[PDB]
Each structure stands twice: as structure tokens, then as C-alpha cells.
Symmetry: D2
Subunit: 303 residues, 4 copies
């Protein structure tokens, strides 16, 4: 009947000193709890293996490199893949990727989709890098993603994951209608990803109290307008003196929030997903082929 149970594994803070081994234990616990509640897939946060290091300015490259993965999975993360296969629960894992190509140390904010067999089905590299590239003194904490990562080079792909068409977004990406639309046009039935969203907005502090609103607004609108189920897993709580947004969620193709976290700690939420529900939108009010007039959208793709 094209049904499944989707889960989101929200993470509480990860300390700068907290080891990957310790984080994996936490991820394994949520994956196991999710499976016990019938979930067939669980979405984890953006950069879920470390503290959100872009908040600091690094002068030592070796120290910066320590936060990146040079292989996926390595011996430390391996246990998560083995448990996923064992319990038949796939997952979306976010991490910092370091790959040397043509003499260049390429750094990406990455996420991978692993199926219920523990196999990596697809990868995505964050295209919309927020923040800044140089240290900015007026900020109480930095957001140097433009400095520590380069824009993704895989576009916005949609993969077949256990008979479900899934697309990935990473944090800031969720706020751009273009990311959602490209994946919607590729037939995505589920669009998921994670995020590290501070509740304080240094550039525009007058928007601080709207942090939850803007995050949920983006998820609801993206789902509705593309007739896609969506899920966002945040890493929340007070991490290294910076409060991060919670409200991890699962959203229906109608834009209705069907599951929402209420704590700022490791938390699992689940929701029954019917892939055919996408038709209520994609065959009617949002029947792309019948209603879209692309000859008028050219400006969106102009360089």
C-alpha cells in the first residue's frame, strides 16, 4: 500500500570534547527506539557527529580537520550501519566531509541516505551555505560555513530508498523554495534533512523570537507546494554556550505538521507515511504538468 513509518532522531547538544564513539552510542539508542516503534527510516541532524564547529574561528588546520570525516563509515561509525541493517531501518546522516581531489582539500557539509539494508544509496552536499567567510567581531558566536565548506557539487538529487523517492536538504537549504522545487520536479515523495539553527540571529536580532516560526513555515510551505512528506531533525539545546533550536518535525504533503519534538535533548518522534497521499496535491491543485508555465520562470535560473 506504499506505506511506511518515518522517524526523526533529534539530538541534544554535542560538546566539543564529546567523542564520536559517545555520539554513536546516542545515535544507536535512538535508532533502536525508533525501530521498536515500527519506524523503517530515521532522519538524523546536520553534522550529527560533532559539535557545530562553524561557530569558532580556527587558525590551526589540523584542529579544523579533526571535525571532518575522511571515510564513511569509518570503524567508529560502522556500528550504526550494522544496526540499521540488523533492525531494517534506514537513515539520513549528516556529517562534515573532507575529500582530497586534484590537490585540493575539498570540504563539504554532507548528508547520506542509507537504506534498511545498511547500504549507502545516495549523497548530497549542502548547496546553500549561510553565514559568512571571515571572522566578524560583532557576533557573539560565528557561523563560518562559507569558510569551512564549499557549495555542494551534486545538485539536488532524488534517490530510490526502499521504494520511496527521497530527496535531501541540509539546514539552511530548507528556506529556499528552489531546493524544494527541483526535488519536487524530480518526483520526491519525502524530502528530509537536519539542522543546527541558533535561536539568536546576530545580523538581525529582531527576528530571534521568530526562529521556530521561520523554521516550521519553511517546512510546511515546502511540503505543501511540492506535495511531499518532509522531516527535519535538529540538534538542539545549549551547545557550547549557544542555544540551538528544537522543534524537529515530520510534515505531511498538505503542509500539516504530524509530529513535533518538545524537548531540547535526544528525542525520537514518528509518523505513519502513506506515499500515495502525495497525489492529493500532485494530481490536483499542484498538478505541475497541467498548471505550470515554465516559459515565465526563466529569471529563477539566470546566472
Amino acid at each position: 500500500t506504499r506505506q511506511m513509518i518515518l522517524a526523526v532522531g533529534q539530538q541534544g547538544p554535542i560538546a566539543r570534547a564529546e567523542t564520536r564513539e559517545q555520539v554513536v552510542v546516542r545515535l544507536l539508542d535512538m535508532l533502536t527506539k525508533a525501530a521498536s516503534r515500527g519506524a523503517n527510516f530515521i532522519v538524523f541532524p546536520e553534522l550529527a557527529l560533532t559539535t557545530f564547529f562553524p561557530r569558532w574561528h580556527f587558525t590551526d588546520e589540523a584542529e579544523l580537520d579533526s571535525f571532518y570525516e575522511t571515510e564513511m563509515p569509518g570503524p567508529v561509525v560502522r556500528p550504526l550501519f550494522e544496526k540499521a541493517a540488523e533492525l531494517g531501518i534506514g537513515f539520513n546522516l549528516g556529517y562534515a566531509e573532507l575529500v582530497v581531489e586534484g590537490g585540493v582539500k575539498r570540504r563539504f557539509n554532507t548528508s547520506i541516505l542509507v537504506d534498511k539494508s545498511g547500504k549507502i544509496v545516495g549523497k548530497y552536499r549542502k548547496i546553500h551555505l549561510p553565514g559568512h567567510k571571515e571572522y566578524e567581531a560583532y557576533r557573539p558566536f560565528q557561523h563560518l560555513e562559507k569558510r569551512y565548506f564549499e557549495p555542494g557539487d551534486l545538485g539536488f538529487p532524488v534517490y530510490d530508498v526502499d521504494a520511496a523517492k527521497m530527496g535531501m536538504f541540509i539546514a539552511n537549504d530548507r528556506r529556499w523554495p528552489e531546493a524544494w522545487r527541483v526535488m519536487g520536479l524530480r518526483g520526491a515523495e519525502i524530502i528530509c534533512g537536519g539542522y543546527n539553527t541558533p535561536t539568536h540571529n546576530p545580523p538581525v536580532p529582531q527576528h530571534d523570537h521568530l526562529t521556530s516560526f521561520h523554521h516550521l513555515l519553511s517546512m510546511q510551505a515546502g511540503s505543501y507546494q511540492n506535495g511531499a512528506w518532509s522531516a527535519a531533525a535538529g540538534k538542539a539545546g545549549m551547545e557550547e554556550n549557544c542555544m540551538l533550536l528544537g522543534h524537529s518535525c515530520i510534515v505531511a504533503p498538505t503542509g500539516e505538521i504530524v509530529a513535533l519534538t518538545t524537548t531540547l535533548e535526544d528525542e525520537v518522534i514518528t509518523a505513519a507515511v502513506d506515499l500515495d497521499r502525495c497525489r492529493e496535491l500532485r494530481e490536483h491543485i499542484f498538478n505541475f504538468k497541467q498548471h505550470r508555465q515554465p516559459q515565465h520562470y526563466g529569471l529563477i535560473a539566470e546566472l
Copy 2:
């Protein structure tokens, strides 16, 4: 100047036999009340001069033509333009446009922007036509816009209206991120329009209770993601046996609803608008030039 007061003139039902003269009296009343409350611009509904005729299956061309405007403004509508100039309040008026080219009739669902001097400074023709194409017997009311109108041929332009950059959308258009984005890329500071949205949708009645939700979600998301003020003027109430959605609104560039109607009759709402507020989004989180990666949005413009 960067400050102004925006108004929305929601309309109650317009009967099939209600004359344009009677409708103009109603529009004049709202425009006058809005100006008395400081407004310098008022947004009126889609097809604001007649009942929403696309709900019927027409068999007589003369009858169909009777609901269109062959000139703008004609002697009957002219008074609205004269009062707008007198009180210094521009407006957005929706109407059915009938044009004859070399003996060939062209039909559009149209809206025009009139400045505080009563001069027409811009036009837009509905690009996203919703509904079905043929008569469907099971429906309590039809929605045959695809038969009675041709998709707009003016694209999604943005016009200068009394020191404000304004873009127009018409009803269904508000649900498409592409419409909003094109105008956002053209620098729109205010994106406005009207709508006739039945609270019942024959093919997907399971979404009926979400009518307000979907309407407001579309306005809030469009405003936020484009850092634009927006306004939607609905024609609400029980019109010719079909209940139409109210909840006309004015929205800030943050996606915050700053004004909302609560009746289903002619109703004026206003809100103070600071055109520089758009910068809170467009120079920061949604600084297009600095964050967008159009090279990866090509699919959106593919025919």
C-alpha cells in the same frame, strides 16, 4: 519616502445580477474609508467587478462576454479612478479582460495597479489558471477558468507605484513559489493581489478544513522567502450558493500576518508599511546575490 499605509478592501459576495454601478458604490465606500484611516493604497479582489462566473458552464457567448470589461475604465468604473486621485490613494483592481484583435477575442483574468494620482501604472494577467477544462456533472459548482481565460502573457512584472516597487499575483498564483520568486528577483517590496477561493473543493474535499491554512501558509511563506510585504484581498461569503474564503490579509516581509479580516462582508483592514523592512531579509538570510546558486535551479525553467 519609505513609509506608507497599505489597505485591503475585502469584498462580500457579488450577485450575478448585481450591476457594476452597484459594485463601484461598494468599492468607493471602502476606498474612502481606507483613505480616512491614512491608507495610500488599497488592494481589491480578483474579478472584483462581477460575481465569480467561472463557477458556471456557459453555453451562450454573449452571456459570457457580459462579465468582461472591454475598456478600463469605462464610464461606470471611472468614478473609482476619480476618487482615488482625489483622496490620494492608489489601488489594485481585478477584472475580466476582453480584447478583440483582428476580430479575434482574447480573454484574461486581469489586475491593474493604479497610483495615488489615479493613473494606471501596471497590468498583470493570471498565469496559473486552476480548475478543470470540461464540464463535470458531479460538482455543485464548476471552476472553468482554463476555458474562460488564456494564461497571462505579461510574465510576472514589478512596477513602480508611488515610490514603491509592487508586483501582482492573482488568486491561485499565490500558491506557486515561482510567481513570488520572479517578482522577488525583480526587487518587489510589496506583492499583492486578490482571490475567489471556495472553502469546498469537489475533487479533494478532504482538504476543505485546511482552506484558510493553505491560503495563509502561501502568503506567509512567499513574503518571508522573498522579504516582501504582501496583501491578499478576497471576495468572501455565500456567493451564488458557493461559500468563499475570507481571511484577507496584509503580511510583513518576515511572513508575520499584521492584519486579518474577520467577517465575510465588505471589510477594510490597514497596516503601516516600511519599505526598508525588506532589507532585514534581503540583505541577510535571503541576500540573493550572496547565497543563491542558480546554476543548480535549471530544472525549474525547463519547458
Copy 3:
């Protein structure tokens, strides 16, 4: 750790001709699915064994009586209690109760709490009966609850159900702050019930589009202000030509909706419940003993 998994079993329509045996099959299916997802308790709708008969005017007492239960459980409903005990999942069941006392045929809109052992722990009889008492011609459908039931005679009790303090409300009750507050003062940790809420409001049709809003507003506010988890199970869909509201939900003590249904059919939703979370409100902003000034609330209890 005072934790559990709460479920809501929303019902789709129940036809006037649909038998209790058929309804029980549907209830058993949801209870089983809920248990498979880890739930320890499931909330069912108000009058969950029959169609919402108050919508019709009855002239035959025998016909009216057919919709009431004279024993709970009887041989037909028995299977549900046996399965609850088997799988270790308690439930809240709503039904029409007919009891003869002192020569009077007493009729109540009732709900019972059954623990994970299949034992009836407590009963509640609807105190706030909405609608009217006499046939009213202007209505497209009636709501004769005042005619078919008498106000409950058990007050608003709170019972110990498997180590959780649970209070019950029935439909309309959820809109009255008094119902919530009495149970809050009695220490309720979970307040639950069901409802049959038409999306059309005959007395005030201008509120039709606010049906979901008012229902969710009532649940969120009640939970927040009493620091109680809550759950509302609706019977939704087109039942005997009357559309009933869906949006069954589970709400945290903060008023946050943690689970929401998206269909208008039989649907199970679940949420992890931590009873100690109530303390975040009841020991702080809503620390009753420290902040309430009952000497000023007398008017609320005046007859």
C-alpha cells in the same frame, strides 16, 4: 521514569446501518496497530459505537434507544476489552449510556477509562451538552444533545490509570476552561476525550472555516494552562451527509501539538509521554499554590 506512549484512534464515519460488531472490528484494528507501535493507552472518539444520532429528530423511542448501551461491555464490545488486556493497552471509549434509576430512563453521553489489564477504572458523563432541545427547521442537520442526554452527574473526576493521573472530557467540554481547570486542580497529568464536530456551524456559519482552529486552540490552551498532556480523538469524514472534523491530536503540557491526524478515516497517531514534563509548568509559571488567588474567582462558581 514515568514514561509511556499515548495513542489516539481517530474514526472515519460510522453509517446509521453499520453494526456495533463492524465498529468493534475497526476499533480492534486500531488498538492492535497502536500496540504494535508501542502504545500503552489509546483514546477513542465520543459515541464511538454508532453514527452521531443527535443529528436527527426521533419520534420513536425504541429507535432512539437502539443507539444506547445498556451494559458495558456487552457480548459485542467484549472483544475490545479482552484484546486491551492481552496486548497491555488501556483505552478511553465513548458511548451513549442508558440506565434506569428510580423509574427514570437516564441518558448520558459517556466515556470510560480502561487500564492495560482490561479493567474499567473510571467513568465520566458529559457535563456540557451543546446544541438544542427541540427540532429547529433552519438547520440542515440537528444537534439534539440537550434532548437525548442529561448533564453528567459525576463532576470532572481524575483517576489513576496505570500510574498516570487521567481526566476525561467529552467533545464540547474541551472548549470550557472550567472543565480543564477542575481536573488540573485535581492533579491530572493527561486529559483526554473524543468528539464529533461538524465542520458546518448552523447557528453561526461565518465560523465554519475556523472549525479546526477553534478545536486545536481549545486543546492547546487547556494543556498549557494546566500543564497537562492532552489527546482528542475525533470521528471524522462525511457521516450521513454531514462532514465531521478530523485533526485528532496529542498535545504536550506546553500546549505544543506533538501528533496530528491528516486523514478523515480510521487513523492511529502516537506520541511519547513523559509525565514529569508537567512539572515544567506546574512548578513554575503555573505553580497554582504559589500564584492563584481563589478569593477573586468566586463568580466562576456562582449559580
Copy 4:
């Protein structure tokens, strides 16, 4: 008359050294702007004449006393009353009240209603005092209202203000259903007040991101369940190193937010108010006399 235009005058921060003369200039500006937009009544914040001093632990009584009013109005505040009478616009003003009885000082967190003739027609003293009673070292700022004020002794009265029945609440009061209900039972058509709500709460920081949610939820629910129009005027912005909540609002008797502020500075919002709108709730779903069962609400009034 049953029609009027209600306004809310949100205040930006008031510095510790900012004089009442300077504050009155700011209040006069908003009152004048509101009247120019047709308003006949404007709601100002709680303790609208000074910085929110309860955030400090005082050690000098003279210093504490300096933040209170010993007369209302004194020569410095009188101009506001004179302008209100001149322009025909009443107001709700919050202030700290110091009364001396037989040499004994009485302190209240107070608000008064002034009609369009500039006459004081009603007073209310905050009954629900939030916060803590002793100095708590870990807090970045205190909230010692329980020490600086005595619970109000006037109950929750409802006054006639220019043909409108108005009731007052002060800040925290808006979160208690009892406050709203008493005024609802007294026939209030408009329930209004102001607030100083930090977006950070030291003892329960996990609710910080819900500050707007909880504030609006309280206003919407109170209005709906009592069929009353309501208005909340906040003093927002970064005041003495503490960020205060904005989102000042005007709400319809249906719980619908009809106007909302979007800045954290002095800001005026207005909305058309029809006093007969209250009937949509109070003569139907919330027809108190016909539906309430006070005999079962006794616990709410128990001391």
C-alpha cells in the same frame, strides 16, 4: 453606538534613566498617531512610565520608590490626559502605584482606563504576580514582583468606557483562565492590558523559543472562550540588557488575531471593533446561561 476603532501602542525599551517627561512625549506621539488613524481608544503597556524595575534586587527603599507614582496624573503625566480629551481617544495606562495609608506604604502593579473625555473611569491592580520572592544569584536578571507589589484588591472589574464594557488584565494575568472568565461573566466586550515579558526565563529556559507562542495562545483562547475582543500592548526590545517580547496584538471574539506588531520599538496598530460581534459566541456556542454548569466548578473557587 456599537462600532469603534481600537489601537495598541506598543513601547520600545524605557531606560533606567529615561524620565517620565521623555516617556510622555513618546506616549503622546503614539496617541496622536492612533487618533489620526481613527482610533478612539489606545492600549499602552504594563508599567508604561518606567523601565521594568522588578528585574533588579533593590537594597534602597528611596530608589525603589522613585519608580512609583504617588498621584495620577501628576503634572508630568497630565499632558497625556489633556491630549486624550482633545483628540477624543481614551487609553489604558499601566504604572506602579504607591499609596500611603496611615504612614504605611501600599504597592501595586496598576492600570487605569481613561475615556475619550480624559476622565479616569476605572482601575485594576495586578492579581497574579509572577516570578520569585528572593534574590537568586544564577539569574541574569530577576523578576521580583512578589516583593515589590501586593496582589490586587479590586478583583477583576468591568467598566463602562464610552459605550464599551471593558475589563483589564496586567501581563501575567492573561495566562490565567480565571481572570478572563470573571470578566467574561461580568459581560466584558473588550479585555485589554499590557506586558513586560522577557524572551528568556531563567528557571525554564527550555520554553524560551515558545515565548511568542504562549503569549498569543493565551490571548486567542481567552478571547474565543469568552467571546471578547482583546488587546495586549507589550513593552518590547532590549531594555537594560534584557530582551522583551513584542508581538503586541488585537484579537477578535473568535480568537482571530486581527492586528500584530512586527517591530520591537514604539509601534501603533489599529483594528475596527464591532461590539456586537461578541454575540456570535455569547449567544451561541458560549451562551453561558444556557450551557454552563457552575454547580460543578466549585473547586476553582476553593481557597
